[PDB]
Amino acid sequence: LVHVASVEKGRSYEDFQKVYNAIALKLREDDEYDNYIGYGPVLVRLAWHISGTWDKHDNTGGSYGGTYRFKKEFNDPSNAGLQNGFKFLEPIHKEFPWISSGDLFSLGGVTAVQEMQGPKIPWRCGRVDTPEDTTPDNGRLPDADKDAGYVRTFFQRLNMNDREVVALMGAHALGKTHLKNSGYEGPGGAANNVFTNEFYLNLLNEDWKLEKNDANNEQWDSKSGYMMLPTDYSLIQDPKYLSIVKEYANDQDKFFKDFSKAFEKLLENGITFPKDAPSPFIFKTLEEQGL
Ligand code: HEM
Hints:
The protein is mostly helical. It is built from 14 helices and 5 strands. It has helices spanning about 15-30, 35, 40-50, 70-75, 85-95, 100-115, 150-155, 160-170, 180, 200-205, 230-235, 240-250, 250-270, 285-290; strands spanning about 5, 210, 220, 225-230, 270. The strands form 2 sheets. It has a 3-stranded antiparallel beta sheet. The protein has a two-stranded parallel ribbon with strand order 1-5.
């Protein structure tokens, strides 16, 4: 199975910048969502979940086909809560019907990271919607109740190595767990709608207590009111992961650089870009445009 990127016919950088801008303007407007967190975090999670179904062995799943629009994937228990992100993007898709679903969902995540003062993430167009029978079965996204070995094995299916895994997980500074979605409750830190290296600082510096939550699942809770999933906490239990956590806690700029690469890689897994395709786009923030 090969998925060749095909640029939406007649579109160029400036067209996609307009879509970016619409997402960013709506992010600015809808600031009350989820007790004033806004939609940034859920859009990042959406972009990751539409990408994280990829299987490197047969090129099934991944962002290319936009298959989250189909009920089997939309209703995956692992995706509970992401419907909020999909509903946010609906008026954007109405305004720009020419964009593919996979391009829109992935672009929502790039837009969110940048508008939350995160790193620039280069982004490529050309994902093409595929039919309902190409939707991956449920069960391809990761469990939270597991250890470092599970995390490492899981992410190898996505061709992610240790540095990429640790960098990607820093997105857990954003937003929060919600008991009704996932059976976990609480934020990873204080700055949960501005992109920073707080996740790593908190892993290393907080006084964590293992507890059961109200859904009877184990999570690690701090005196400050923060939480870590067992899979988050595993990054300071495994010696290889711990070394990289310390690196990112000490150097936010290095984290930003590594996250940007890893996140682009995640969003592009499964896609073959013709050697003549446009170079990756780097979108201007609203602030950079005076908008
Ligand atoms: C071992 C891998 C991972 C596991 C087990 C995991 C698990 C979870 C869980 C259980 C939630 C809470 C969902 C809810 O209750 O609403 C969550 C939220 C979130 N995840 Fe992950 N995740 C993983 C990796 C990632 C990656 C790679 C990213 C993106 C780079 C990511 C981004 C996010 C974001 C931004 C939220 C906050 C969503 C919100 O506030 O609505 N996660 N994750």
